[PDB]
Amino acid sequence: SMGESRVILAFGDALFAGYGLDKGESYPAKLETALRSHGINARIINAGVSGDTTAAGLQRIKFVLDSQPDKPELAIVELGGNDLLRGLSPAEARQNLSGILEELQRRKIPILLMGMRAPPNLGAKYQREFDGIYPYLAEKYDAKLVPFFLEAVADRPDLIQKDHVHPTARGVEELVSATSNAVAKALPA
């Protein structure tokens, strides 16, 4: 092909940063290769930061855009998972993401929003509220939405890293049954 690469900003959290993966295995790195098959030579700016909340993304979006030598031609926004993991207000996550999209829209940078979904642990009220923020934002900011970014791995535990292992309430009971003897023995009589 002739010409310089198309510049895409991948603005996100651990899922963009490539947490737990080797060089070149991250989603942005593999997406850059895959777009060659669409006839596109892209340079994808990896602005993934592991553990970023929507508030942390809002805090840095201007800095990240002002740091670019070449203005992004598309910004892919993937945040809210860490808000979920901290049980933070869905309303505040919506407000934070709105601030990020407003800054992109001010600069006339097209937006692709990666939809996040809440697991059942947070309960149905929280899950419905959180899940609804992404279509709301996509409509409000005229953004393209991928409704469920992690849909392709949702039923594929073989495609998910083993990392954090937080027991359920029943799992805690299991651990107590296994370890109470050792605790009772360790405590002086």
Residue numbers in the entry: 0 to 188
Give the authors' words.
Here, we reported the enzymatic characterizations and crystal structures of marine bacterial esterases CrmE10 and AlinE4. The results showed that both CrmE10 and AlinE4 belong to the SGNH-hydrolase superfamily and the bacterial lipolytic enzyme GDSL family. The SGNH-hydrolase family, a superfamily that includes the bacterial lipolytic enzyme GDSL family, consists of enzymes possessing four strictly conserved residues, Ser, Gly, Asn, and His, in four conserved blocks, I, II, III, and V, respectively. Among these four residues, Ser and His serve as catalytic residues, and Ser, Gly, and Asn serve as oxyanion hole residues.
According to sequence alignment, the catalytic triad of CrmE10 consisted of Ser29, Asp178, and His181, and it was composed of Ser13, Asp162, and His165 in AlnE4. In this reaction, Ser is a nucleophile residue, and His is the proton donor/acceptor. In SGNH-hydrolase family enzymes, the residue Ser on the catalytic triad was considered an essential element for aromatic acyl substrate binding, and His was considered as the proton donor/acceptor.
